[PDB]
Design an enzyme around this catalytic site. Structure first.
Site, PDB file in Angstrom:
ATOM      1  N   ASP A   1      -3.417  30.964   9.064  1.00 55.08           N
ATOM      2  CA  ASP A   1      -4.242  30.159   8.606  1.00 55.08           C
ATOM      3  C   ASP A   1      -4.804  30.852   7.225  1.00 55.08           C
ATOM      4  O   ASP A   1      -5.869  30.953   7.071  1.00 55.08           O
ATOM      5  CB  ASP A   1      -5.321  29.918   9.646  1.00 55.08           C
TER       6      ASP A   1
ATOM      7  N   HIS B   1     -19.950  29.860   9.283  1.00 56.18           N
ATOM      8  CA  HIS B   1     -19.890  29.182  10.471  1.00 56.18           C
ATOM      9  C   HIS B   1     -18.564  28.660  10.741  1.00 56.18           C
ATOM     10  O   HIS B   1     -17.763  28.611   9.908  1.00 56.18           O
ATOM     11  CB  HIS B   1     -21.067  28.116  10.454  1.00 56.18           C
ATOM     12  N   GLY B   2     -18.335  28.220  12.013  1.00 49.48           N
ATOM     13  CA  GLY B   2     -17.101  27.178  12.263  1.00 49.48           C
ATOM     14  C   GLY B   2     -17.448  26.510  13.602  1.00 49.48           C
ATOM     15  O   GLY B   2     -18.670  26.499  14.087  1.00 49.48           O
ATOM     16  N   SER B   3     -16.736  26.236  14.076  1.00 50.06           N
ATOM     17  CA  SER B   3     -16.866  25.058  15.445  1.00 50.06           C
ATOM     18  C   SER B   3     -17.300  25.987  16.397  1.00 50.06           C
ATOM     19  O   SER B   3     -17.988  25.297  17.479  1.00 50.06           O
ATOM     20  CB  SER B   3     -15.470  24.424  15.992  1.00 50.06           C
ATOM     21  N   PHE B   4     -16.963  27.211  16.576  1.00 53.35           N
ATOM     22  CA  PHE B   4     -17.461  28.113  17.562  1.00 53.35           C
ATOM     23  C   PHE B   4     -18.765  28.694  17.644  1.00 53.35           C
ATOM     24  O   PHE B   4     -19.357  29.049  18.632  1.00 53.35           O
ATOM     25  CB  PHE B   4     -16.510  29.227  17.120  1.00 53.35           C
ATOM     26  N   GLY B   5     -19.618  28.689  16.364  1.00 51.30           N
ATOM     27  CA  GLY B   5     -20.812  28.882  16.298  1.00 51.30           C
ATOM     28  C   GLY B   5     -20.851  29.716  15.058  1.00 51.30           C
ATOM     29  O   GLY B   5     -20.120  29.384  13.846  1.00 51.30           O
ATOM     30  N   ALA B   6     -21.760  30.692  14.815  1.00 49.51           N
ATOM     31  CA  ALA B   6     -22.022  31.318  13.457  1.00 49.51           C
ATOM     32  C   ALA B   6     -21.525  32.691  13.504  1.00 49.51           C
ATOM     33  O   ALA B   6     -21.339  33.285  14.371  1.00 49.51           O
ATOM     34  CB  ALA B   6     -23.546  31.219  13.125  1.00 49.51           C
ATOM     35  N   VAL B   7     -21.470  33.304  12.216  1.00 52.00           N
ATOM     36  CA  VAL B   7     -21.065  34.433  11.910  1.00 52.00           C
ATOM     37  C   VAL B   7     -22.453  35.091  11.358  1.00 52.00           C
ATOM     38  O   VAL B   7     -23.098  34.483  10.590  1.00 52.00           O
ATOM     39  CB  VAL B   7     -20.105  34.770  11.090  1.00 52.00           C
TER      40      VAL B   7
ATOM     41  N   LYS C   1     -19.303  37.601  14.809  1.00 47.22           N
ATOM     42  CA  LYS C   1     -18.961  36.331  14.997  1.00 47.22           C
ATOM     43  C   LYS C   1     -19.101  35.798  16.690  1.00 47.22           C
ATOM     44  O   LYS C   1     -18.782  36.427  17.339  1.00 47.22           O
ATOM     45  CB  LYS C   1     -17.436  36.087  14.427  1.00 47.22           C
TER      46      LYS C   1
HETATM   47  N1  ADP Z   1     -16.248  40.285   8.684  1.00 45.63           N
HETATM   48  C1  ADP Z   1     -16.847  39.419   8.126  1.00 45.63           C
HETATM   49  N2  ADP Z   1     -17.632  39.898   7.038  1.00 45.63           N
HETATM   50  C2  ADP Z   1     -18.261  38.841   6.211  1.00 45.63           C
HETATM   51  N3  ADP Z   1     -18.097  37.489   6.419  1.00 45.63           N
HETATM   52  C3  ADP Z   1     -17.343  36.994   7.621  1.00 45.63           C
HETATM   53  C4  ADP Z   1     -16.887  37.981   8.311  1.00 45.63           C
HETATM   54  N4  ADP Z   1     -16.044  37.514   9.060  1.00 45.63           N
HETATM   55  C5  ADP Z   1     -16.371  35.916   8.946  1.00 45.63           C
HETATM   56  N5  ADP Z   1     -17.184  35.812   7.655  1.00 45.63           N
HETATM   57  C6  ADP Z   1     -17.691  34.696   6.981  1.00 45.63           C
HETATM   58  O1  ADP Z   1     -17.546  33.790   8.145  1.00 45.63           O
HETATM   59  C7  ADP Z   1     -16.759  32.619   7.665  1.00 45.63           C
HETATM   60  C8  ADP Z   1     -16.158  31.841   8.941  1.00 45.63           C
HETATM   61  O2  ADP Z   1     -15.462  32.944   9.810  1.00 45.63           O
HETATM   62  P1  ADP Z   1     -14.215  32.725  10.246  1.00 45.63           P
HETATM   63  O3  ADP Z   1     -13.823  33.894  11.320  1.00 45.63           O
HETATM   64  O4  ADP Z   1     -13.121  32.373   9.325  1.00 45.63           O
HETATM   65  O5  ADP Z   1     -14.398  31.639  11.300  1.00 45.63           O
HETATM   66  P2  ADP Z   1     -13.453  30.044  11.471  1.00 45.63           P
HETATM   67  O6  ADP Z   1     -12.636  30.756  12.518  1.00 45.63           O
HETATM   68  O7  ADP Z   1     -14.227  29.250  12.595  1.00 45.63           O
HETATM   69  O8  ADP Z   1     -12.912  29.663  10.181  1.00 45.63           O
HETATM   70  C9  ADP Z   1     -15.798  33.333   6.757  1.00 45.63           C
HETATM   71  O9  ADP Z   1     -15.214  32.269   5.958  1.00 45.63           O
HETATM   72  C10 ADP Z   1     -16.738  34.211   5.848  1.00 45.63           C
HETATM   73  O10 ADP Z   1     -17.554  33.381   4.952  1.00 45.63           O
HETATM   74 MG    MG Z   2     -12.180  30.736   8.727  1.00 45.10          MG
END
Ligand code: ADP
Ligand code: MG
Length: 307
Positions: free
Chosen positions: A140, A25-31, A46
């Site tokens: 980042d 997850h992050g501010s945007f939503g979930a993965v 994402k």
């Molecule tokens: N392609 C991916 N495959 C597996 N896990 C992922 C992938 N992209 C993101 N994640 C998981 O989701 C988390 C957050 O994704 P991220 O793109 O870093 O978002 P944020 O931009 O908001 O930090 C990652 O730290 C990871 O744990």
């Molecule tokens: Mg990230």
């Protein structure tokens, strides 16, 4: 306009992907972990919402991240599969990875082994050398944005702060991992790809010590200390000299004194022989440790066993 419409596929992703399980997850939503219903391929999705009060900034950030991912082709950058749109949510589709380097830290509650650090660093450096050769900057770099595929390959991910040009000026990054010259630029001055090398150095410390330096401060206090004070170093004397020299070279505060990505690929720490199976064995020992976790910890880390 077409410049924006052309970023997106035109079909509804809701039908296309099945079996969604959150993996971040992050501010945007979930993965999510998900499977294409027709091809059976496993992907990461994402989902980034741009509803509500922060719609403009959220949408710009989606657009920037999509445009950045669209340009990439390299074995150590996450593979981009394109982007769908539905109901104020962009579905950014990527190759699926087992977890981040931060996840590996969290599962073991210990630093990684030095040769694991080296392997991860080595792969990350290839990605950074690619980026920098294309006038790009990640901005980042941190253990949570370095992923591992289940077969053991290192992928840079999270291009949500990234620059399409170099030099750049924006005050962006995650404060504990930010280079001093980004901070000193104050959104006006310039820096280049070497900011990722500082961040890599901090990441090295993170993998060695579980957390970056200054993590007991707020962002405001850390940013001041990063600008004002001597760069951090590895605390323990257990580490090999080569690893300690690597870190110190990354953490030169003056960019002209810091190596490029191409230069650091020739450093002993990443050139030193290491076992063929280092990343495969790190993955396996991680799965085996997830299987032993209590349910409190397993609830958080169960994604590691999703395949
Ligand atoms: N392609 C991916 N495959 C597996 N896990 C992922 C992938 N992209 C993101 N994640 C998981 O989701 C988390 C957050 O994704 P991220 O793109 O870093 O978002 P944020 O931009 O908001 O930090 C990652 O730290 C990871 O744990
Ligand atoms: Mg990230």
């Amino acid at each position: 306009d077409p410049e924006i419409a052309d970023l997106f596929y035109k079909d509804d992703p809701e039908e296309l992907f099945i079996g969604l399980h959150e993996i971040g997850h992050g501010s945007f939503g979930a993965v999510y972990f998900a499977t294409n219903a027709h091809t059976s391929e496993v992907v990461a999705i994402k989902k980034m919402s741009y509803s509500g009060k922060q719609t403009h900034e959220k949408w710009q950030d989606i657009l920037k991240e999509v445009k950045f991912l669209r340009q990439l082709k390299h074995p150590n950058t996450i593979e981009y599969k394109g982007c769908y749109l539905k109901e104020h949510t962009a579905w950014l589709v990527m190759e699926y990875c087992l977890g981040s380097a931060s996840d590996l830290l969290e599962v073991h509650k210990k630093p990684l082994q030095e040769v694991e650090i080296a392997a991860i660093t080595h792969g990350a450096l290839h990605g950074l050398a690619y980026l920098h050769s294309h006038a790009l900057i990640h901005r980042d770099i941190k253990a949570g944005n370095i992923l591992l595929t289940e077969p053991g390959q290192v992928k840079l991910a999270d291009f949500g702060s990234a620059s399409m040009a170099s030099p750049a000026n924006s005050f962006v990054g995650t404060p504990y991992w930010m280079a001093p010259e980004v901070i000193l630029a104050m959104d006006e001055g310039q820096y280049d790809g070497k900011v990722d090398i500082w961040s890599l150095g901090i990441t090295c410390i993170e993998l060695a010590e579980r957390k970056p330096p200054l993590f007991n401060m707020n962002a405001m206090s850390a940013l001041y200390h990063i600008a004002q004070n001597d760069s951090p170093t590895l605390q323990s004397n257990e580490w090999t000299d080569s690893f300690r020299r690597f870190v110190d070279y990354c953490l030169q505060k003056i960019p002209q004194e810091r190596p490029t990505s191409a230069e650091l690929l020739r450093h002993d720490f990443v050139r030193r022989d290491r076992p063929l199976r280092v990343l495969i064995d790190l993955i396996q020992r991680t799965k085996d440790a997830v299987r032993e976790l209590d349910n409190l910890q397993y609830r958080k880390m169960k994604k590691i066993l999703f395949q």
